[PDB]
Short mmCIF file of C-alpha atoms and ligand atoms in Angstrom, two decimals:
data_model
loop_
_atom_site.label_atom_id
_atom_site.label_comp_id
_atom_site.label_asym_id
_atom_site.label_seq_id
_atom_site.Cartn_x
_atom_site.Cartn_y
_atom_site.Cartn_z
CA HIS A 36 402.38 260.12 7.30
CA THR A 37 399.10 261.57 8.61
CA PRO A 38 395.91 261.34 6.50
CA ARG A 39 393.29 264.08 6.75
CA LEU A 40 389.62 263.41 6.01
CA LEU A 41 387.94 266.42 4.46
CA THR A 42 384.16 266.04 4.38
CA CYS A 43 381.65 267.91 2.23
CA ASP A 44 377.97 267.86 1.29
CA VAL A 45 378.61 267.18 -2.38
CA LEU A 46 381.73 265.73 -3.95
CA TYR A 47 382.50 265.55 -7.66
CA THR A 48 385.66 263.76 -8.82
CA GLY A 52 378.80 261.34 -11.40
CA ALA A 53 378.73 263.37 -8.17
CA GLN A 54 378.48 261.89 -4.67
CA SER A 55 376.69 263.05 -1.51
CA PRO A 56 377.71 263.13 1.24
CA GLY A 57 381.34 263.29 0.14
CA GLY A 58 384.89 263.13 1.41
CA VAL A 59 388.53 263.24 0.36
CA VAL A 60 391.44 261.77 2.28
CA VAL A 61 394.60 263.79 1.81
CA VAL A 62 398.12 262.75 2.78
CA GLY A 63 400.47 265.72 2.66
CA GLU A 64 399.46 267.49 -0.56
CA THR A 65 398.31 264.32 -2.31
CA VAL A 66 394.86 262.78 -2.59
CA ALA A 67 394.80 259.33 -1.00
CA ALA A 68 391.21 258.53 -1.88
CA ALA A 69 387.95 260.21 -2.83
CA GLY A 70 384.45 258.84 -2.39
CA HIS A 71 381.83 258.32 0.28
CA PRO A 72 382.97 259.50 3.77
CA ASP A 73 381.84 256.46 5.77
CA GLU A 74 383.94 254.28 3.49
CA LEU A 75 386.84 256.60 4.36
CA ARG A 76 386.37 256.75 8.14
CA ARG A 77 386.52 252.96 7.95
CA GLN A 78 389.60 252.91 5.71
CA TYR A 79 391.42 255.61 7.70
CA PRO A 80 390.38 255.38 11.39
CA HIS A 81 393.28 257.54 12.58
CA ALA A 82 392.66 260.29 10.04
CA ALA A 83 391.62 263.58 11.62
CA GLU A 84 388.39 264.99 10.21
CA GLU A 85 387.84 268.44 8.74
CA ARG A 86 384.51 269.92 7.66
CA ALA A 87 385.40 271.25 4.20
CA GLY A 88 382.17 273.02 3.27
CA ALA A 89 379.33 272.25 0.88
CA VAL A 90 381.24 271.40 -2.27
CA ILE A 91 384.51 269.76 -3.22
CA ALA A 92 385.01 269.58 -6.98
CA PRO A 93 387.09 270.91 -9.87
CA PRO A 94 386.50 274.61 -10.62
CA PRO A 95 383.15 275.02 -12.41
CA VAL A 96 382.78 275.98 -16.05
CA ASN A 97 380.93 279.19 -16.88
CA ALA A 98 379.20 277.81 -19.96
CA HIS A 99 377.60 281.09 -20.98
CA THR A 100 378.55 284.72 -20.50
CA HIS A 101 379.30 287.88 -22.47
CA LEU A 102 382.60 289.59 -21.60
CA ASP A 103 381.80 292.30 -24.15
CA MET A 104 378.40 293.38 -25.49
CA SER A 105 376.78 295.99 -27.72
CA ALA A 106 374.14 298.64 -27.20
CA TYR A 107 372.66 297.02 -30.30
CA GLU A 108 371.82 293.72 -28.62
CA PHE A 109 370.29 295.59 -25.66
CA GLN A 110 368.19 297.76 -27.97
CA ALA A 111 366.98 294.69 -29.88
CA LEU A 112 365.55 293.06 -26.73
CA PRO A 113 362.63 295.02 -25.15
CA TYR A 114 362.58 293.08 -21.87
CA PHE A 115 366.16 294.10 -21.12
CA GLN A 116 364.94 297.70 -21.18
CA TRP A 117 362.13 296.91 -18.75
CA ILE A 118 364.78 296.27 -16.09
CA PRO A 119 366.74 299.58 -15.87
CA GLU A 120 369.46 298.23 -13.58
CA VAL A 121 370.42 295.67 -16.22
CA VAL A 122 370.80 298.27 -18.96
CA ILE A 123 372.75 300.51 -16.57
CA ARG A 124 375.07 297.69 -15.46
CA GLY A 125 375.60 296.63 -19.06
CA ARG A 126 376.89 299.97 -20.35
CA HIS A 127 380.48 299.37 -19.23
CA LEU A 128 380.63 295.98 -20.97
CA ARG A 129 382.03 297.40 -24.19
CA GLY A 130 385.37 296.80 -25.87
CA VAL A 131 388.73 295.17 -25.30
CA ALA A 132 389.70 296.69 -21.94
CA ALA A 133 386.48 295.58 -20.24
CA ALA A 134 386.69 292.14 -21.87
CA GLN A 135 390.29 291.61 -20.73
CA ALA A 136 389.29 292.51 -17.18
CA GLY A 137 386.48 289.97 -17.35
CA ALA A 138 388.86 287.27 -18.55
CA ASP A 139 391.18 288.20 -15.67
CA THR A 140 388.28 287.68 -13.26
CA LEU A 141 387.54 284.25 -14.72
CA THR A 142 391.16 283.23 -14.21
CA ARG A 143 391.22 284.47 -10.62
CA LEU A 144 388.04 282.44 -10.03
CA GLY A 145 389.76 279.15 -10.85
CA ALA A 146 390.42 279.27 -14.58
CA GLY A 147 387.52 276.92 -15.22
CA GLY A 148 386.42 276.71 -18.83
CA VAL A 149 384.24 279.42 -20.33
CA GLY A 150 381.63 279.69 -23.07
CA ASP A 151 381.90 283.33 -24.09
CA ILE A 152 379.73 285.17 -26.57
CA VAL A 153 381.79 287.78 -28.43
CA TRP A 154 380.45 290.85 -30.20
CA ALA A 155 383.33 293.14 -31.21
CA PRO A 156 385.85 291.61 -33.65
CA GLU A 157 388.69 293.37 -31.80
CA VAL A 158 387.61 291.63 -28.60
CA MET A 159 387.80 288.27 -30.36
CA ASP A 160 391.32 289.18 -31.52
CA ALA A 161 392.32 289.89 -27.91
CA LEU A 162 390.61 286.95 -26.20
CA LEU A 163 391.75 284.44 -28.79
CA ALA A 164 395.30 285.37 -27.71
CA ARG A 165 394.68 284.79 -23.99
CA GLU A 166 396.88 281.83 -23.05
CA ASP A 167 395.10 281.57 -19.69
CA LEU A 168 391.58 281.00 -21.05
CA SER A 169 390.03 277.68 -22.04
CA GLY A 170 386.68 276.81 -23.60
CA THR A 171 384.90 278.32 -26.59
CA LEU A 172 384.60 281.87 -27.93
CA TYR A 173 381.37 282.23 -29.92
CA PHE A 174 381.17 285.08 -32.46
CA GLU A 175 377.70 286.60 -32.22
CA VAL A 176 375.72 287.30 -35.39
CA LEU A 177 372.56 289.42 -35.42
CA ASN A 178 370.42 290.51 -38.38
CA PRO A 179 366.67 289.78 -38.82
CA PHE A 180 366.40 290.93 -42.47
CA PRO A 181 366.11 287.99 -44.93
CA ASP A 182 367.47 290.09 -47.81
CA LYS A 183 370.68 290.79 -45.89
CA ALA A 184 371.30 287.15 -44.97
CA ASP A 185 373.75 286.25 -47.76
CA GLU A 186 375.99 289.26 -47.25
CA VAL A 187 375.94 289.05 -43.46
CA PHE A 188 376.87 285.36 -43.67
CA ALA A 189 379.73 286.09 -46.08
CA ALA A 190 381.09 288.81 -43.77
CA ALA A 191 380.83 286.49 -40.77
CA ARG A 192 382.47 283.61 -42.64
CA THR A 193 385.45 285.77 -43.58
CA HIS A 194 386.11 286.68 -39.93
CA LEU A 195 385.61 283.06 -38.86
CA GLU A 196 387.99 281.69 -41.49
CA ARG A 197 390.63 284.17 -40.35
CA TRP A 198 390.25 283.30 -36.65
CA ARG A 199 390.06 279.54 -37.25
CA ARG A 200 393.76 279.70 -38.16
CA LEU A 201 394.61 281.37 -34.84
CA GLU A 202 392.63 278.85 -32.82
CA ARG A 203 394.72 276.67 -30.49
CA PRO A 204 394.21 273.55 -28.32
CA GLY A 205 391.94 274.38 -25.40
CA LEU A 206 390.42 277.58 -26.79
CA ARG A 207 388.25 277.08 -29.87
CA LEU A 208 386.20 279.34 -32.13
CA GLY A 209 382.43 279.06 -32.16
CA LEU A 210 379.38 280.72 -33.67
CA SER A 211 376.38 282.30 -32.04
CA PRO A 212 373.22 283.21 -33.98
CA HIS A 213 371.75 285.72 -31.47
CA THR A 214 368.13 284.54 -31.15
CA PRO A 215 365.44 282.97 -33.35
CA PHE A 216 363.90 286.40 -33.91
CA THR A 217 366.93 288.66 -34.42
CA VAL A 218 368.36 286.40 -37.14
CA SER A 219 366.38 285.75 -40.33
CA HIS A 220 365.44 282.14 -41.12
CA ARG A 221 367.80 282.25 -44.10
CA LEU A 222 370.80 283.55 -42.13
CA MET A 223 370.09 281.07 -39.32
CA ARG A 224 370.32 278.11 -41.70
CA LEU A 225 373.39 279.49 -43.47
CA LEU A 226 375.07 279.78 -40.08
CA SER A 227 374.04 276.41 -38.66
CA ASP A 228 374.88 274.55 -41.89
CA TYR A 229 378.25 276.30 -42.07
CA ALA A 230 379.09 275.50 -38.44
CA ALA A 231 377.88 271.91 -38.72
CA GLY A 232 380.02 271.41 -41.81
CA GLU A 233 383.12 273.11 -40.39
CA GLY A 234 382.80 271.57 -36.94
CA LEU A 235 382.16 274.89 -35.17
CA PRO A 236 380.23 274.75 -31.88
CA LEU A 237 376.98 276.72 -31.75
CA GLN A 238 375.07 278.58 -29.04
CA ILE A 239 371.66 280.18 -29.62
CA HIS A 240 369.64 282.10 -27.01
CA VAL A 241 366.17 280.55 -27.13
CA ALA A 242 362.86 281.22 -25.37
CA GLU A 243 364.46 283.41 -22.70
CA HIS A 244 361.44 285.62 -21.91
CA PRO A 245 357.77 284.54 -21.98
CA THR A 246 356.97 287.29 -24.49
CA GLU A 247 359.17 285.46 -27.03
CA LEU A 248 356.96 282.37 -26.89
CA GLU A 249 353.93 284.65 -27.14
CA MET A 250 354.93 286.33 -30.40
CA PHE A 251 355.73 283.01 -32.06
CA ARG A 252 352.15 282.06 -31.20
CA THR A 253 350.38 285.32 -32.08
CA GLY A 254 352.85 287.46 -34.02
CA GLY A 255 352.45 290.09 -31.33
CA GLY A 256 352.63 290.75 -27.60
CA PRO A 257 354.78 292.98 -25.31
CA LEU A 258 358.09 292.03 -26.95
CA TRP A 259 357.28 292.44 -30.63
CA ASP A 260 354.77 295.26 -30.14
CA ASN A 261 357.35 297.28 -28.20
CA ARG A 262 360.43 296.74 -30.38
CA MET A 263 362.32 299.53 -32.12
CA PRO A 264 360.75 299.37 -35.63
CA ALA A 265 363.86 300.27 -37.63
CA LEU A 266 365.75 297.24 -36.25
CA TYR A 267 363.39 294.61 -37.70
CA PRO A 268 361.30 293.70 -40.77
CA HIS A 269 357.66 294.81 -40.41
CA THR A 270 356.39 291.38 -39.30
CA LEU A 271 357.84 288.45 -37.38
CA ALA A 272 356.61 286.26 -40.24
CA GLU A 273 359.11 287.98 -42.51
CA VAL A 274 361.92 287.23 -40.07
CA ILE A 275 361.13 283.53 -39.60
CA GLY A 276 359.76 282.76 -43.06
CA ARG A 277 356.43 281.41 -41.84
CA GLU A 278 353.30 282.67 -40.11
CA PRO A 279 353.16 282.66 -36.31
CA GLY A 280 350.45 280.35 -35.00
CA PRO A 281 348.89 278.70 -31.88
CA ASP A 282 350.96 275.55 -32.32
CA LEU A 283 354.27 277.29 -33.00
CA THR A 284 357.13 277.92 -30.58
CA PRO A 285 360.66 279.17 -31.14
CA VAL A 286 361.92 275.63 -30.49
CA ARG A 287 359.54 274.00 -32.97
CA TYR A 288 360.52 276.73 -35.43
CA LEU A 289 364.22 275.85 -35.18
CA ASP A 290 363.52 272.13 -35.24
CA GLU A 291 361.44 272.27 -38.43
CA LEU A 292 363.90 274.73 -39.95
CA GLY A 293 366.50 271.99 -39.61
CA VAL A 294 368.73 274.01 -37.30
CA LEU A 295 368.57 271.55 -34.39
CA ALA A 296 370.15 269.00 -36.73
CA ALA A 297 373.48 270.74 -36.06
CA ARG A 298 373.04 269.99 -32.33
CA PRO A 299 373.49 273.63 -31.27
CA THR A 300 373.63 274.37 -27.55
CA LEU A 301 370.46 276.23 -26.57
CA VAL A 302 370.71 278.97 -23.94
CA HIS A 303 368.09 279.95 -21.33
CA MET A 304 365.22 277.85 -22.69
CA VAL A 305 362.89 279.02 -19.94
CA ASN A 306 359.64 279.35 -21.82
CA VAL A 307 359.23 276.01 -23.57
CA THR A 308 356.55 273.33 -23.76
CA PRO A 309 356.70 269.60 -23.09
CA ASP A 310 356.83 269.04 -26.84
CA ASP A 311 359.70 271.53 -27.14
CA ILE A 312 361.63 269.52 -24.54
CA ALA A 313 360.98 266.31 -26.49
CA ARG A 314 362.32 267.93 -29.68
CA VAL A 315 365.47 269.08 -27.87
CA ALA A 316 366.06 265.62 -26.41
CA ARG A 317 365.60 263.95 -29.81
CA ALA A 318 368.11 266.30 -31.44
CA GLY A 319 370.69 265.69 -28.73
CA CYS A 320 371.12 269.40 -27.98
CA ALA A 321 372.69 270.50 -24.70
CA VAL A 322 371.23 273.49 -22.85
CA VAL A 323 372.77 276.18 -20.66
CA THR A 324 370.75 277.74 -17.85
CA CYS A 325 371.69 281.06 -16.16
CA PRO A 326 369.71 281.08 -12.85
CA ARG A 327 370.38 284.55 -11.46
CA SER A 328 370.11 286.22 -14.86
CA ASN A 329 366.66 284.70 -15.46
CA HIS A 330 365.51 285.92 -12.07
CA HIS A 331 366.73 289.50 -12.49
CA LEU A 332 365.27 289.74 -15.99
CA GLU A 333 361.94 288.33 -14.75
CA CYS A 334 362.02 285.63 -17.42
CA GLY A 335 360.47 282.90 -15.34
CA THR A 336 362.29 279.78 -14.15
CA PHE A 337 364.10 277.14 -16.24
CA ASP A 338 362.38 273.79 -15.65
CA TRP A 339 365.51 271.83 -14.76
CA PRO A 340 363.62 268.81 -13.41
CA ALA A 341 361.71 268.49 -16.69
CA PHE A 342 364.90 268.71 -18.77
CA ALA A 343 366.71 266.28 -16.46
CA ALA A 344 363.86 263.77 -16.71
CA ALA A 345 364.01 264.06 -20.52
CA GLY A 346 367.71 263.25 -20.38
CA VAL A 347 368.90 266.58 -21.76
CA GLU A 348 372.46 267.59 -20.84
CA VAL A 349 372.35 270.76 -18.74
CA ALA A 350 375.21 273.20 -18.13
CA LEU A 351 375.44 276.34 -16.00
CA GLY A 352 376.31 279.90 -16.95
CA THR A 353 376.09 283.29 -15.22
CA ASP A 354 375.31 285.25 -18.38
CA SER A 355 376.97 288.70 -18.48
CA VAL A 356 377.34 290.52 -15.15
CA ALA A 357 374.70 293.03 -16.27
CA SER A 358 372.03 290.48 -15.31
CA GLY A 359 373.99 287.69 -13.64
CA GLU A 360 375.71 289.70 -10.90
CA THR A 361 379.07 287.89 -11.13
CA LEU A 362 381.08 285.52 -13.35
CA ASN A 363 381.28 282.96 -10.52
CA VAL A 364 379.23 279.85 -11.36
CA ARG A 365 379.62 278.56 -7.79
CA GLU A 366 377.02 281.19 -6.96
CA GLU A 367 374.63 279.86 -9.62
CA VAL A 368 374.85 276.43 -7.99
CA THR A 369 373.75 277.96 -4.69
CA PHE A 370 370.93 279.83 -6.42
CA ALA A 371 369.85 276.71 -8.32
CA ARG A 372 369.69 274.71 -5.08
CA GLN A 373 367.09 277.20 -3.90
CA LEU A 374 365.15 277.11 -7.18
CA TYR A 375 364.91 273.32 -7.28
CA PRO A 376 364.25 271.94 -3.76
CA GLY A 377 363.37 268.49 -5.07
CA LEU A 378 366.33 268.29 -7.44
CA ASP A 379 369.30 266.21 -6.28
CA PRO A 380 372.17 268.64 -5.44
CA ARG A 381 374.58 266.19 -7.08
CA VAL A 382 372.94 267.03 -10.40
CA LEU A 383 373.73 270.73 -9.92
CA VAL A 384 377.42 270.20 -9.22
CA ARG A 385 377.89 267.70 -12.04
CA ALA A 386 376.23 270.18 -14.39
CA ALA A 387 378.46 273.04 -13.25
CA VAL A 388 381.60 271.03 -13.91
CA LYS A 389 381.03 268.17 -16.37
CA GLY A 390 377.99 269.63 -18.10
CA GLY A 391 379.84 272.85 -18.87
CA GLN A 392 383.00 271.06 -19.97
CA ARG A 393 380.98 269.08 -22.51
CA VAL A 394 379.48 272.30 -23.89
CA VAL A 395 382.63 274.44 -24.07
CA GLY A 396 385.21 271.69 -24.51
CA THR A 399 388.29 268.78 -16.38
CA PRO A 400 390.89 268.17 -13.66
CA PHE A 401 390.54 264.76 -12.01
CA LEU A 402 390.27 264.33 -8.25
CA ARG A 403 391.59 260.87 -7.38
CA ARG A 404 394.41 258.89 -5.75
CA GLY A 405 397.80 260.28 -6.71
CA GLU A 406 396.56 263.68 -7.88
CA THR A 407 397.90 266.80 -6.17
CA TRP A 408 395.29 268.12 -3.73
CA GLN A 409 394.46 271.69 -4.78
CA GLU A 410 392.77 274.34 -2.67
CA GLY A 411 390.86 275.17 -5.84
CA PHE A 412 388.81 271.99 -5.31
CA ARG A 413 387.46 273.32 -2.02
CA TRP A 414 384.77 275.78 -3.16
CA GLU A 415 384.26 277.32 0.29
CA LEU A 416 387.69 278.96 -0.09
CA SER A 417 387.05 280.61 -3.46
CA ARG A 418 388.40 284.16 -3.89
CA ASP A 419 387.71 286.47 -6.84
CA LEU A 420 390.74 288.63 -5.99
ZN1 LIG B 501 373.78 285.52 -23.70
#
């Protein structure tokens, strides 16, 4: 027949750069380094196929439905009006179903979705086109309410666990280290660890979070809505904030990292925090655009990579992440980390995410799919 050599900047079948794929008809003949290919197929016509050739990326963290409650609980979300405004429509089943539709049109790559409304979980759990993990979000900073909140959450979880099918599993998501009491956090992590339920916790997203764990105050805590929290952060976390404390150290000493939960954002951490995460074997999900729009600072990917921590990519909800298309986060991340090997970004988008949410192979014999050529991606 007639082989075609499609070349790209980064290929992921470990990622390779430069990259290339020889296609014969609609079948992959070979995939690897391009020079190897031009030498193996001298008569093959070449085609510049764009920057990336790889399976559709996994959106390891997003919210297809949210609550005014979680917006109200986080002061820094309010400081960026556009985010609150954009987030208002992200309520209920209809909006969630439309989001899932978008994910499917984008390549049907896996997804790590945080769910708020029980009715949304009912609907998404029944989506035969989705794959990944649906994490039920739990939020309550009052120690005295921990037992009852846990019991209510467990009931829902036990019910849904029976509806769970291969490819789309149920997960749990304690909101943050400061909107969930220390008692409820441990009840949740222990339960999930024992039942084999994946976990995702938003940690150290904004710098003001690290500040209050150190001083008990600052722009976040001092500007919260009083009725939504106990009178002191100490009451929420069960210990006094201090100079040597951080939300990560808090979770580590609380014994929550023992369950190997996936930590989201993780922008404002210290070298010691990174060491604790690496030791525990926790994976982390970074949402580039979201962090930028929420003025949270920048995730230190090179530091996490050097520590050997598994990194995945997410877009976060569209309120702060713009779109549900992770291909766009890869582009953004390339700009954020000039010294970081682009191959690391692509591998993270695909393999990293798959490992977090639970990947098509691109090799000889496999059907060549246009979905592997990112430059041709359509969200409609
Ligand atoms: Zn989130």
